[PDB]
Amino acid sequence: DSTECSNLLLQYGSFCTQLNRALTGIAVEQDKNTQEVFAQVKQIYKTPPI
Amino acid sequence: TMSLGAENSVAYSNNSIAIPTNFTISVTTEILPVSMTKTSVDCTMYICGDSTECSNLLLQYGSFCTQLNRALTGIAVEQDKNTQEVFAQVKQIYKTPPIKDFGGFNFSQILPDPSKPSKRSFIEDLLFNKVTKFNGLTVLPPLLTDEMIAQYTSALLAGTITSGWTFGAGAALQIPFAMQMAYRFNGIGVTQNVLYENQKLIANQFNSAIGKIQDSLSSTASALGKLQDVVNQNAQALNTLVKQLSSNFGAISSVLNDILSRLDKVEAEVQIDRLITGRLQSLQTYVTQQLIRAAEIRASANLAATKMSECVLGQSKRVDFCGKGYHLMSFPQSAPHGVVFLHVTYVPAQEKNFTTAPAICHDGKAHFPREGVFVSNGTHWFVTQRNFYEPQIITTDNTFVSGNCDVVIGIVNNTVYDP
Amino acid sequence: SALGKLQDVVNQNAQALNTLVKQLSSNFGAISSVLNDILSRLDKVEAEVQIDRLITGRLQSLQTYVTQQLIRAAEIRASANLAATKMSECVLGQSKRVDFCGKGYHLMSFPQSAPHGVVFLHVTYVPAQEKNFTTAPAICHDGKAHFPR
Amino acid sequence: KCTLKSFTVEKGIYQTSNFRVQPTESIVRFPNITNLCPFGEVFNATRFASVYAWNRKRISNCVADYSVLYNSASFSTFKCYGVSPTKLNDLCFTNVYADSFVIRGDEVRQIAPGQTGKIADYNYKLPDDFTGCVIAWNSNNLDSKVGGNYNYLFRLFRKSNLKPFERDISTEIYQAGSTPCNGVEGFNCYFPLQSYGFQPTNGVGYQPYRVVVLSFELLHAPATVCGPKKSTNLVKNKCVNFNFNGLTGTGVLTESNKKFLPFQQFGRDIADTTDAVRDPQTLEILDITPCSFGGVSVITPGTNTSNQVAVLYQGVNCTEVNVFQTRAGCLIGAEHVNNSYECDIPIGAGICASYQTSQSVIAYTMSLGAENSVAYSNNSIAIPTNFTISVTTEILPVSMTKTSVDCTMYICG
Amino acid sequence: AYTNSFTRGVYYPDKVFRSSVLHSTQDLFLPFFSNVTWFHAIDNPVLPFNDGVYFASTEKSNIIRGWIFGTTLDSKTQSLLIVNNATNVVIKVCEFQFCNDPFLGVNCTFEYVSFKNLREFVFKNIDGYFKIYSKHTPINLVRDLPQGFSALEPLVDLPIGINITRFQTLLALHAAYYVGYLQPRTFLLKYNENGTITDAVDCALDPLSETKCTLKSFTVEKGIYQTSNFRVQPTESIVRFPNITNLCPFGEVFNATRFASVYAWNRKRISNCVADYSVLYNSASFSTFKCYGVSPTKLNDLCFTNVYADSFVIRGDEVRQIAPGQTGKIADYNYKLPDDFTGCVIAWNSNNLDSKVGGN
Numbered sequence A: 001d002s003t004e005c006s007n008l009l010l011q012y013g014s015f016c017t018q019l020n021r022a023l024t025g026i027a028v029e030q031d032k033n034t035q036e037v038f039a040q041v042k043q044i045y046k047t048p049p050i
Numbered sequence B: 001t002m003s004l005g006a007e008n009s010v011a012y013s014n015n016s017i018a019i020p021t022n023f024t025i026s027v028t029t030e031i032l033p034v035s036m037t038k039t040s041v042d043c044t045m046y047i048c049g050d051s052t053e054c055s056n057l058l059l060q061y062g063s064f065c066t067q068l069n070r071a072l073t074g075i076a077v078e079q080d081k082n083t084q085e086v087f088a089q090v091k092q093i094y095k096t097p098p099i100k101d102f103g104g105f106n107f108s109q110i111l112p113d114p115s116k117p118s119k120r121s122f123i124e125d126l127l128f129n130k131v132t133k134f135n136g137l138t139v140l141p142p143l144l145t146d147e148m149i150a151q152y153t154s155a156l157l158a159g160t161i162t163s164g165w166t167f168g169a170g171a172a173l174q175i176p177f178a179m180q181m182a183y184r185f186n187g188i189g190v191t192q193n194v195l196y197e198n199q200k201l202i203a204n205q206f207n208s209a210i211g212k213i214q215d216s217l218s219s220t221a222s223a224l225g226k227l228q229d230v231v232n233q234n235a236q237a238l239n240t241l242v243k244q245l246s247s248n249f250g251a252i253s254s255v256l257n258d259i260l261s262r263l264d265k266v267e268a269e270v271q272i273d274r275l276i277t278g279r280l281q282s283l284q285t286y287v288t289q290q291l292i293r294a295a296e297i298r299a300s301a302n303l304a305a306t307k308m309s310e311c312v313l314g315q316s317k318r319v320d321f322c323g324k325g326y327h328l329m330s331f332p333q334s335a336p337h338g339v340v341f342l343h344v345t346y347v348p349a350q351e352k353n354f355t356t357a358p359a360i361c362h363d364g365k366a367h368f369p370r371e372g373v374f375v376s377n378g379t380h381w382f383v384t385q386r387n388f389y390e391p392q393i394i395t396t397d398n399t400f401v402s403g404n405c406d407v408v409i410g411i412v413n414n415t416v417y418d419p
Numbered sequence C: 001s002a003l004g005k006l007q008d009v010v011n012q013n014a015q016a017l018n019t020l021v022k023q024l025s026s027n028f029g030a031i032s033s034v035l036n037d038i039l040s041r042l043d044k045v046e047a048e049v050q051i052d053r054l055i056t057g058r059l060q061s062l063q064t065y066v067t068q069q070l071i072r073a074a075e076i077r078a079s080a081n082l083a084a085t086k087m088s089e090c091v092l093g094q095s096k097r098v099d100f101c102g103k104g105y106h107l108m109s110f111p112q113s114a115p116h117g118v119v120f121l122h123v124t125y126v127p128a129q130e131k132n133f134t135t136a137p138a139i140c141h142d143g144k145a146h147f148p149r
Numbered sequence D: 001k002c003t004l005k006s007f008t009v010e011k012g013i014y015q016t017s018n019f020r021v022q023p024t025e026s027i028v029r030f031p032n033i034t035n036l037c038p039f040g041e042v043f044n045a046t047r048f049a050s051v052y053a054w055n056r057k058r059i060s061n062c063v064a065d066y067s068v069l070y071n072s073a074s075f076s077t078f079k080c081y082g083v084s085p086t087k088l089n090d091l092c093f094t095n096v097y098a099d100s101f102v103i104r105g106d107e108v109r110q111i112a113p114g115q116t117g118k119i120a121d122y123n124y125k126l127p128d129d130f131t132g133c134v135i136a137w138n139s140n141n142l143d144s145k146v147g148g149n150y151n152y153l154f155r156l157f158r159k160s161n162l163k164p165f166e167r168d169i170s171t172e173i174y175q176a177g178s179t180p181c182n183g184v185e186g187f188n189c190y191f192p193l194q195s196y197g198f199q200p201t202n203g204v205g206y207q208p209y210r211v212v213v214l215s216f217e218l219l220h221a222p223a224t225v226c227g228p229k230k231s232t233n234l235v236k237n238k239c240v241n242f243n244f245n246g247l248t249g250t251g252v253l254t255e256s257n258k259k260f261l262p263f264q265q266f267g268r269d270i271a272d273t274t275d276a277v278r279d280p281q282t283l284e285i286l287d288i289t290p291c292s293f294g295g296v297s298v299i300t301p302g303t304n305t306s307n308q309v310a311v312l313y314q315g316v317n318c319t320e321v322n323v324f325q326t327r328a329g330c331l332i333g334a335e336h337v338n339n340s341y342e343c344d345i346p347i348g349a350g351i352c353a354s355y356q357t358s359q360s361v362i363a364y365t366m367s368l369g370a371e372n373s374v375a376y377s378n379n380s381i382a383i384p385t386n387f388t389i390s391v392t393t394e395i396l397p398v399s400m401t402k403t404s405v406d407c408t409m410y411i412c413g
Numbered sequence E: 001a002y003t004n005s006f007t008r009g010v011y012y013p014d015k016v017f018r019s020s021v022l023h024s025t026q027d028l029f030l031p032f033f034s035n036v037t038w039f040h041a042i043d044n045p046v047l048p049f050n051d052g053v054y055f056a057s058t059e060k061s062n063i064i065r066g067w068i069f070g071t072t073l074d075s076k077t078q079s080l081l082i083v084n085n086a087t088n089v090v091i092k093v094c095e096f097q098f099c100n101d102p103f104l105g106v107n108c109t110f111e112y113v114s115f116k117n118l119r120e121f122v123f124k125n126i127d128g129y130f131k132i133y134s135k136h137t138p139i140n141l142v143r144d145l146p147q148g149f150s151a152l153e154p155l156v157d158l159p160i161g162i163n164i165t166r167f168q169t170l171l172a173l174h175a176a177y178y179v180g181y182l183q184p185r186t187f188l189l190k191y192n193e194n195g196t197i198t199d200a201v202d203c204a205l206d207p208l209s210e211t212k213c214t215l216k217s218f219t220v221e222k223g224i225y226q227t228s229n230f231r232v233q234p235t236e237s238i239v240r241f242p243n244i245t246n247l248c249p250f251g252e253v254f255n256a257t258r259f260a261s262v263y264a265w266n267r268k269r270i271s272n273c274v275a276d277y278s279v280l281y282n283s284a285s286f287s288t289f290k291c292y293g294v295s296p297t298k299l300n301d302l303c304f305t306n307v308y309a310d311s312f313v314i315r316g317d318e319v320r321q322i323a324p325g326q327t328g329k330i331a332d333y334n335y336k337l338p339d340d341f342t343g344c345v346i347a348w349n350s351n352n353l354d355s356k357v358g359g360n
């Protein structure tokens, strides 16, 4: 949170935004992996009691 | 809070079963990326912009520029491996008879039409409308043209219609289409006469189903999301790599000829060596993301090749691999950088509940069904195949004996007819 | 040309090592690439600013080799899982899967060991000498339709 | 052979270098503003301003020669920022400004971007981004006098420091403590200007120095100051080396359909490179492209079997530079053939090449396979009457040699 | 009285042509949907100027004539006067003072000289350097600016060289005008095919605008986007140490007549004072000055636990040895500086003193 360093970091253009693009790509994919393993069943079946 | 799915409970008991009386032949679309844009970058023209003054500094960093050219070349060259392994499975370019006497099945939506200016099928020619710099960047062409790719999907489809799975086995043994479908039904345990005794309806279901896919693509925006994503990612990567030439990296200008116009050698070379470090970091980042993204596309291409062999060149026992429901057959269609499978599946429908038992007791012998299951309508007993209701009389032929009645839990008293 | 895949796996690794070793000769904008020259010819505060180039360059050179080796290892792992699958399905069994255990109908397979890899021999049945015949779906006899078992 | 570090090379297509269309000649274009700027009214001036009230002279609408300055023996100090002095005669600028004053020699190190000390604090603050030169010299021969020259003053006191090129002639009494001054001096209440009193006998650090500071208006904007450099005829639709107003370049100069607003001097690309310029003599909007380029892919048979060759200039059309043109590039040495063989060396877009008899590399559209009409009819089936066993071989990699690198031994030895 | 600024603030940021492109730029701009102050002819009060000002006037026949800028406006310090014939200008920078209700009846150091439509003639300042832009406009509510976007037709963009903190407009005698301060903003600007600016985003307006600026896009697809972080400025400044009033003894220690042999270097401790190091780093007596871990020009902002004035005489050759990481007989056998030394080395030739008469 130094403004003085933040201005010097703008000198590098877009490394410090394409890294958020990469990490968000990994992050959304974790929901997709979880979805594709479990959500194969289309209805919430429940057993009879007995 | 997201809903996981609608509530249901199966009406289970130790003596009740449900059997389908009808079915709905259902056609489903699966889309896979097979290749991606073959970019290539001249690293020296990107980094140095034709300055010899810069080139003399860039040699001090040695072999980075050559191994960056080597890495992007290996990515671009395997795209011409993937596309060959996915499509070029068929050894000979088969072609159809002149007339469409396929037992009632209307293939005119997915076979070629020489009326088209590019000899795609109707659905392939639809798919190609669904999917949408001097700085040393280039885009190379693929080894196969879109027109050559449409000959491979046409050969794979024409071999399938005229000779079934046999061309995958080694030779195109011709067969009537409705008899081929009978051997597809017998592969999913539905006894083959269920086909012939409904052939007109199975044709009406299939012909309606391909029609709904033409309409689905002729309306839906999001359908090709997987291919459009792979197209968008390579544009987003190049537009990032080019905007990175404008960055100062702390040097007194973004423009290398501005530095060379304003500063004397030792004062200029401090600024240029700073831009070289920034531009070279910005190129190694891009090549690393392309190496990662390429190995990901190759996982999709090996999956597509496996579906071409097991779903299209065959019939598969692998549950939910070649679309939902029981697999009958699949037709491949080409798309930009990708393949689309149409998978045709038998889905059972219109159940009825029945009483059931594991065995039947006669002259003290326990009788079991050879295929299918015993059921009762409430007053009589019958045997039917599992995947389709068909009440045969219970007989000494469609059943077999093992030991006395007293062993089996839940056995029932009924007579067996002896022909 | 037979063992192309295995030789490509040996050749790529030897090439990346040679490329990583050769980057020890590069200057990275220092007055020399040989670290003793900077340590001999220069006073400590000037020598250390020159060494910081060689450290930056040699490190960036090594990070590029390690990143290639991680990606190449993931490619060998995908092949190791596939060989482990073909050991279980093709050798230890018979496969209904078209093409998976070689072309034709799969009968049987044998593994053979190789440098850095495995070579399968896939035994398959290929149909040949086709006669043409007239055919029909069913026979009508006594007014009943008969279907083949 | 050199690219692959071997004389023995297997059959294939291989990269070698980026080819480029060469520049034909050099084109140097500058405004024809032929009158000379007034530097004799600046360095050889008859009187100089006090540093508290320094004088700014616009330099504009002219040619100039900075070598006359930097070759001179006359100057005791000649710092430059944003530019190197030996380069100055190649440049142009929208204006130059000469700021002028006298100080004592000890103060000269305060005349630098963003500095501190009474001159930089309260008299002349240079900006942090300074683009320009500071020229300073001893003037004890002219600006120093018996009993002291008191014509020069400097601000010793201020409430707050100057902003860059802020300038302050005011004469309020400085309040140095809680005592209010109310328009007169006293204890804690002092007049803000000192005076130097330069005597000809005083030490070389206390002696007077003239200072002139050339700020450069070095914008990519309409030029009005230029060096002595000459101007040539113009060229269009040809690859040339060039310079407009000190912006150097190398490219295909062309006419354009662009329409600059009246204040705009250059147009720029996404890559921040210039892609259009307004000609300084003619007011026409030229476009620029870099001259055309691509990979030199070389097609070869194996160098054991033959050393005859063909070359693909990737993606380009031979109009931009046996031969044939393809969507894959301008292809040289290879001989076109109608008959579609199986693909040997891949080129792209359905083309391949091979080495064949009459000897040449040949270029052909690849065969996809033998073509086979299938005998389908609604009542015919074929059934095999025999079989063959087959024994396909399949090969898979499982490991690669286990290597580890000690990163400290590799980096530091 | 206030009214809505809509989107009227934009100007071409630089003298470069760009076309068919979206460009992200940080500068002073008039932020969107902000409060312009609004005025009409019955009047021209003196106003603060802040960092820069947007001015616009919608008027029937050159009723507005120019402006005065400055600080005190009283001939005790410098001021800028502008009087104008639409775009042909008289400019003077001066101690000047026209009659102190300034109007037109129909000592200086820089000088320069060149409804169906109520006119948009529109102006803004950065530093002292007015940007001037214009268009026609029909009107039906003379209270308010028209909503439609325009960075208008260019007229003037010139620099000068002065100082300002207040300003005032000049009127003819024998109209409506607006004022709104600029603030530092990132704007995203859109250039059309012909290099004209046609749209803009004020990235601090709302979360949607911050999203647009994060993506470098004017249109956003359905989804969730990461854009910013909750962090807060130094809202006040706080100082905490055992406080003190003594001026430091440096003005006695450097002016002391005696000095030490370097093998026996004098660690004179210094503590418990206010100090001023500009007294030292501007003193031309010092033949050498160095600083390590600190910059000499920064020193007057700092504070320290303790200070030590390690002091001695050496010969002119040996001066180079007095730095961190050095070698040589003085450094190695008289006074060794740490490899990580923090502070300053202050040195002068003393051949006027330590070289005592008849030699020492």
Ligand SMILES: *[C@@H]1O[C@H](CO)[C@@H](O)[C@H](O)[C@H]1NC(C)=O
Residues within 6 Å of the ligand: B011, B018, B351, B352, B353
């Ligand atoms: C089978 O019986 C259960 C009894 O509760 C009923 O809910 C269900 O709808 C029945 N299903 C069919 C296919 O008849």
Ligand SMILES: *[C@@H]1O[C@H](CO)[C@@H](O)[C@H](O)[C@H]1NC(C)=O
Residues within 6 Å of the ligand: B377, B378, B379, B380
């Ligand atoms: C059960 O099936 C037999 C033969 O179709 C029929 O005679 C009988 O009426 C049926 N019973 C019921 C309850 O439908």
Ligand SMILES: *[C@@H]1O[C@H](CO)[C@@H](O)[C@H](O)[C@H]1NC(C)=O
Residues within 6 Å of the ligand: B014, B015, B409, B410
């Ligand atoms: C099913 O449950 C009933 C009691 O509800 C019981 O009489 C019968 O024997 C059971 N049969 C089996 C197969 O468990």
Ligand SMILES: *[C@@H]1O[C@H](CO)[C@@H](O)[C@H](O)[C@H]1NC(C)=O
Residues within 6 Å of the ligand: B413
């Ligand atoms: C089944 O039939 C036999 C002969 O009619 C009878 O003895 C027996 O009790 C019946 N029930 C069972 C469950 O065996």
Ligand SMILES: *[C@@H]1O[C@H](CO)[C@@H](O)[C@H](O)[C@H]1NC(C)=O
Residues within 6 Å of the ligand: C130, C131, C132, D375, D382
């Ligand atoms: C089957 O008969 C047709 C008759 O035209 C012939 O073309 C075809 O080659 C025959 N097939 C085989 C495998 O003999």
Ligand SMILES: *[C@@H]1O[C@H](CO)[C@@H](O)[C@H](O)[C@H]1NC(C)=O
Residues within 6 Å of the ligand: D032, D280, D281
């Ligand atoms: C430069 O000289 C030519 C005549 O040689 C003239 O046409 C042109 O107008 C001059 N440039 C300007 C800025 O007038």
Ligand SMILES: *[C@@H]1O[C@H](CO)[C@@H](O)[C@H](O)[C@H]1NC(C)=O
Residues within 6 Å of the ligand: D304, D305, D306
């Ligand atoms: C090497 O090339 C020669 C012709 O130059 C050819 O005759 C020979 O067969 C090649 N070598 C091999 C191993 O085939």
Ligand SMILES: *[C@@H]1O[C@H](CO)[C@@H](O)[C@H](O)[C@H]1NC(C)=O
Residues within 6 Å of the ligand: D317, D318, D319, D320, D325, D326, D327
């Ligand atoms: C090659 O370039 C010319 C223009 O120089 C163009 O007309 C032609 O269409 C290009 N060739 C091909 C095969 O398109």
Ligand SMILES: *[C@@H]1O[C@H](CO)[C@@H](O)[C@H](O)[C@H]1NC(C)=O
Residues within 6 Å of the ligand: D336, D337, D338
């Ligand atoms: C290709 O074949 C045609 C005849 O089919 C002939 O006229 C033409 O000259 C041939 N072209 C080449 C390049 O061989």
Ligand SMILES: *[C@@H]1O[C@H](CO)[C@@H](O)[C@H](O)[C@H]1NC(C)=O
Residues within 6 Å of the ligand: B101, B103, D378, D379
């Ligand atoms: C099968 O083909 C014959 C002509 O060879 C035709 O008479 C008959 O109607 C066809 N039947 C079907 C179901 O296509």
Ligand SMILES: *[C@@H]1O[C@H](CO)[C@@H](O)[C@H](O)[C@H]1NC(C)=O
Residues within 6 Å of the ligand: E002, E033, E034, E035
């Ligand atoms: C404009 O001024 C009003 C008070 O007159 C205030 O409520 C409003 O918040 C101001 N506008 C903005 C954007 O803050």
Ligand SMILES: *[C@@H]1O[C@H](CO)[C@@H](O)[C@H](O)[C@H]1NC(C)=O
Residues within 6 Å of the ligand: E084, E085, E088, E089, E090, E113, E114
């Ligand atoms: C503006 O108009 C006045 C009155 O005619 C005139 O004195 C002045 O010189 C004009 N200035 C300009 C720059 O046109």
Ligand SMILES: *[C@@H]1O[C@H](CO)[C@@H](O)[C@H](O)[C@H]1NC(C)=O
Residues within 6 Å of the ligand: D053, D169, E095, E107, E108, E109
């Ligand atoms: C007029 O300005 C000069 C500097 O430009 C200043 O020295 C002088 O004192 C001013 N005139 C008066 C009457 O103060």
Ligand SMILES: *[C@@H]1O[C@H](CO)[C@@H](O)[C@H](O)[C@H]1NC(C)=O
Residues within 6 Å of the ligand: E192, E193, E194, E196
């Ligand atoms: C841009 O210029 C072209 C002529 O080159 C013109 O047709 C078009 O209307 C212009 N568009 C705009 C929005 O200025």
Ligand SMILES: *[C@@H]1O[C@H](CO)[C@@H](O)[C@H](O)[C@H]1NC(C)=O
Residues within 6 Å of the ligand: E243, E244, E245
């Ligand atoms: C020291 O701090 C106290 C309050 O904490 C204050 O009254 C006093 O004036 C301060 N003295 C100095 C020298 O800052």
